[PDB]
């Protein structure tokens, strides 16, 4: 039942289109806004915000990013063929992972800033969250990705595989996911071969790196939630609670 060369070429096109339609911010917009940087006054504003308010803002923005990943999944060839259980298992495990990868587009390695609420700012913007080590990990991961200089098509094909990972515990139709994963691998490898970029394969993040960053995020969320349980109830998006609570 395996896929022809034509089907694989179609799959490259399909995956790239799905990403294009759901990437949330356009790369050209992000790049052209690099000179727009939060002033010292604005940074001070952020640092003076309360821990709970900063956490609620970041949860909102993450949730919005996650909704775009869900849309990506829905437009991905063969996602709709998965049973409902496995769709949830894959997204619960992978959505945040995809967001962490997508973040490199919004990260400027020249001055170590990220696009956030309309301007570029460094890690210090996030001081009020009270989780410097997590922030540092996130910026380090974005920095490692910046060095690969992913194309948009590469980001598309790689994030597809981050999502369609047959090793998630709990999948009920493992074999179907293995087949979808394999074909997505063929598409990614085909694209790389045609563009003479197979050398990136050896440079991709080590297997459980993404898992580590996500596990740290959940731990910090649990510590927050433990310290401020009513804030999470009253002001975090329902989707965020379902994903992470």
């Amino acid at each position: 039942p395996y896929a022809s060369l034509t089907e694989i070429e179609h799959l490259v096109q399909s995956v790239c289109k799905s990403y294009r339609e759901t990437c949330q911010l356009r790369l050209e917009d992000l790049l052209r806004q690099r000179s727009n940087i939060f002033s010292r006054e604005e940074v001070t504003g952020y640092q003076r915000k309360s821990m709970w308010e900063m956490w609620e803002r970041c949860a909102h923005h993450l949730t919005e990013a996650i909704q775009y990943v869900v849309e990506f999944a829905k437009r991905l060839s063969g996602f709709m063929e998965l049973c409902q259980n496995d769709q949830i298992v894959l997204l619960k495990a992978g959505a945040m992972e995809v967001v962490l990868v997508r973040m490199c587009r919004a990260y400027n390695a020249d001055n170590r800033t990220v696009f956030f609420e309309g301007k570029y700012g460094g890690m210090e913007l996030f001081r009020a969250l009270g989780c410097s080590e997590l922030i540092s990990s996130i910026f380090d991961f974005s920095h490692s990705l910046s060095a690969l200089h992913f194309s948009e098509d590469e980001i598309a094909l790689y994030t597809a595989l981050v999502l369609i990972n047959a090793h998630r515990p709990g999948l009920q139709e493992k074999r179907k996911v293995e087949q979808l994963q394999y074909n997505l691998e063929l598409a990614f490898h085909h694209h790389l071969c045609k563009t003479h970029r197979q050398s990136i394969l050896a440079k991709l993040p080590p297997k459980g790196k993404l898992r580590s960053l996500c596990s740290q995020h959940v731990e910090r969320l649990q510590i927050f939630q433990h310290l401020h349980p009513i804030v999470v109830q009253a002001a975090f998006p329902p989707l965020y609670k379902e994903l992470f609570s």
């Binding site: 849309e71 769709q87 379902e242």
Partner: peptide, 11 residues
């Protein structure tokens, strides 16, 4: 146990 997630998947 995932009503908002199913709602998005259904939209």
């Amino acid at each position: 146990e995932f009503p908002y997630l199913l709602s998005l998947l259904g939209e």
